[PDB]
Design a protein around this ligand. Structure first.
Ligand SMILES: CCCCCCCCCCCCCCCCCC(=O)OC[C@H](COP(=O)([O-])OCC(O)COP(=O)([O-])OC[C@@H](COC(=O)CCCCCCCCCCCCCCCCC)OC(=O)CCCCCCCCCCCCCCCCC)OC(=O)CCCCCCCCCCCCCCCCC
Ligand SMILES: CCCCCCCCCCCCCCCCCC(=O)OC[C@H](COP(=O)([O-])OCC(O)COP(=O)([O-])OC[C@@H](COC(=O)CCCCCCCCCCCCCCCCC)OC(=O)CCCCCCCCCCCCCCCCC)OC(=O)CCCCCCCCCCCCCCCCC
Ligand SMILES: COC1=C(OC)C(=O)C(C/C=C(\C)CC/C=C(\C)CC/C=C(\C)CC/C=C(\C)CC/C=C(\C)CC/C=C(/C)CC/C=C(\C)CCC=C(C)C)=C(C)C1=O
Lengths: 209, 209
């Protein structure tokens, strides 16, 4: 039992009443269904994962005490405390340093947690859908400056083209059929008027600005 | 106590617990406020209207029994049962008929329930905001046929004017400035061309159909 199981019971108090008091004691399939989904304390409700941590925590911690509980290398240098000849005194702080580094075991796990991964090749294979790429893919690249600067450049110039596009359509509206068919036309073209028909001059077919 | 009061209790059951148990006895003002809005049997909760009906129902019913319990006028005609000389036998069924007519006392109460009120003058005052009108207002009236037939006529003719209006704007768009300024113009008008300017030909400024 734990607090989280007790919270479920308070929430499932009415459900426990329906299934246990009414259904569980009925005959037929309604009873088999209630006795099967009966609410209470858990049969085999232990959590092996939580129990696994407790075991490995206690076993690894006893190792820490042995590795960390060492006689000092510094105190053995004066030959006045407990150590005259210690030819392996320079190994005293190897296991302690090794245990202290274990604090970073999970903080630094895998390649991405030891470097800036976007600058490494594996990151690319992940962004391509876990797809194999040539090893020189990090070099054959287009400038990120161009892609973002050109996207702004193109849009800023379209705003200025929209204004110019309006003045041209306006000035062309005040032009005769003769001019709008001879200006910018091929020299070999002989103009021949067309029958006048009604064709509106709508800038944007959709009612947009 | 009645069922409607009991229904309030089941709905106010939790509210009663908060006022009568917690607020009604906490201390100071919260007590005076909870003891004032206490929940329980209604003090002076009787309904005089209910009793007023019960009393008048009983008194009027005792009158119905007397008025309806009369010796028959038909049986007294033969001079063979219980009645030889009854000079007021023709009054036997006056009170019975008068009581049976009482069943329409409330069904026919006021002028509106005895006739078709919209054909009566008082109805006009109610629709005019309870305002005095001349007695001959029911005669000075415009035909309801015209009001409703003209409302439909005007709309059916506008749908046909919209189509005619489009064909005219189209035929005029293909017209020269000289034609659209001299046709339908006054005879004494001398046409003088104006400088050409860009003025769109938009049917509806609002983007409607
Ligand atoms: C604003 C700030 C306010 C400041 C003021 C506040 C003051 C507060 C004071 C608080 C107290 C601070 C704690 C220290 C003083 C305590 C007083 C005392 O008496 O201590 C007794 C105390 C008592 O011992 P203990 O309690 O029984 O156990 C202590 C330890 O648990 C275990 O003890 P141990 O003795 O067993 O551990 C030994 C270990 C201790 O750990 C270390 O110190 C690491 C040492 C690694 C570096 C060693 C350098 C060796 C010589 C290099 C020479 C060149 C230098 C150039 C450097 C250039 C740099 C680029 O060192 C070793 O590993 C020894 C062997 C090392 C290998 C030797 C290899 C030699 C040959 C190499 C040849 C290769 C080159 C050849 C080229 C030739 C060309 C000519 O012992 C200590 O000294 C404790 C020190 C442990 C570290 C504590 C650090 C706490 C965190 C403080 C912040 C970090 C500061 C330290 C930075 C050091 C530089 C990186
Ligand atoms: C087809 C469907 C399927 C049917 C098949 C199933 C058949 C099963 C039937 C089951 C039961 C049927 C019920 C009837 C059978 C009763 C048999 C029996 O033994 O009962 C004895 C039964 C025993 O007495 P009781 O149980 O002690 O009490 C009985 C009553 O509670 C109270 O008794 P009461 O005696 O005290 O009531 C008296 C009352 C009874 O109420 C009435 O019957 C109303 C009477 C109105 C007609 C009066 C006729 C006057 C004579 C005029 C002569 C000409 C006639 C021309 C007619 C032309 C028409 C355009 O009559 C009066 O008020 C007498 C006073 C008359 C007014 C005074 C002035 C009279 C002279 C006025 C002259 C004016 C002339 C001026 C100008 C002249 C110029 C030439 O007495 C009855 O007679 C029971 C009558 C129950 C009421 C029946 C009528 C119900 C209303 C139905 C709606 C109207 C439809 C009929 C209209 C008729 C024409 C207006
Ligand atoms: C048949 O023989 C006869 C008698 O029997 C002997 C008589 O007693 C009598 C005497 C008659 C009387 C003493 C009764 C007189 C009654 C009169 C004058 C009118 C009474 C008027 C009132 C009591 C006020 C009522 C006010 C309203 C209805 C306005 C607000 C609306 C209300 C309250 C109801 C809401 C309206 C609805 C349509 C919803 C209806 C709701 C329900 C049915 C819910 C019912 C709930 C329950 C729990 C039963 C006669 C004349 C008679 O002929």
């Amino acid at each position: 039992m734990n607090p989280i199981q007790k919270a479920w019971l308070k929430i499932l108090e009415p459900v426990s009443y329906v299934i246990n008091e009414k259904m569980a004691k009925r005959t037929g399939i309604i009873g088999k269904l209630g006795r099967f989904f009966a609410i209470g304390p858990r049969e085999y409700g232990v959590h092996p994962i939580n129990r696994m941590f407790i075991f490995m925590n206690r076993k690894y911690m006893a190792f820490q005490a042995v590795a960390l509980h060492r006689y000092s290398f510094v105190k053995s240098l004066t030959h006045n405390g407990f150590h005259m000849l210690r030819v392996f005194r320079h190994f005293a702080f190897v296991l302690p340093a090794t245990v202290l580094a274990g604090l970073g075991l999970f903080v630094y796990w895998g390649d991405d947690n030891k470097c800036y991964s976007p600058d490494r090749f594996p990151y690319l294979k992940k962004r391509a859908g876990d797809m194999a790429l040539p090893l020189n893919s990090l070099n054959q690249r287009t400038s990120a400056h161009y892609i973002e600067i050109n996207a702004i450049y193109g849009a800023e110039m379209m705003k200025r083209y929209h204004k110019v596009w309006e003045n041209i359509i306006e000035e062309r509206s005040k032009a005769t059929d003769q001019e709008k068919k001879t200006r910018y036309a091929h020299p070999s073209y002989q103009y021949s008027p067309l029958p006048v028909v009604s064709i509106p001059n709508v800038l944007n077919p959709l009612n947009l600005q």
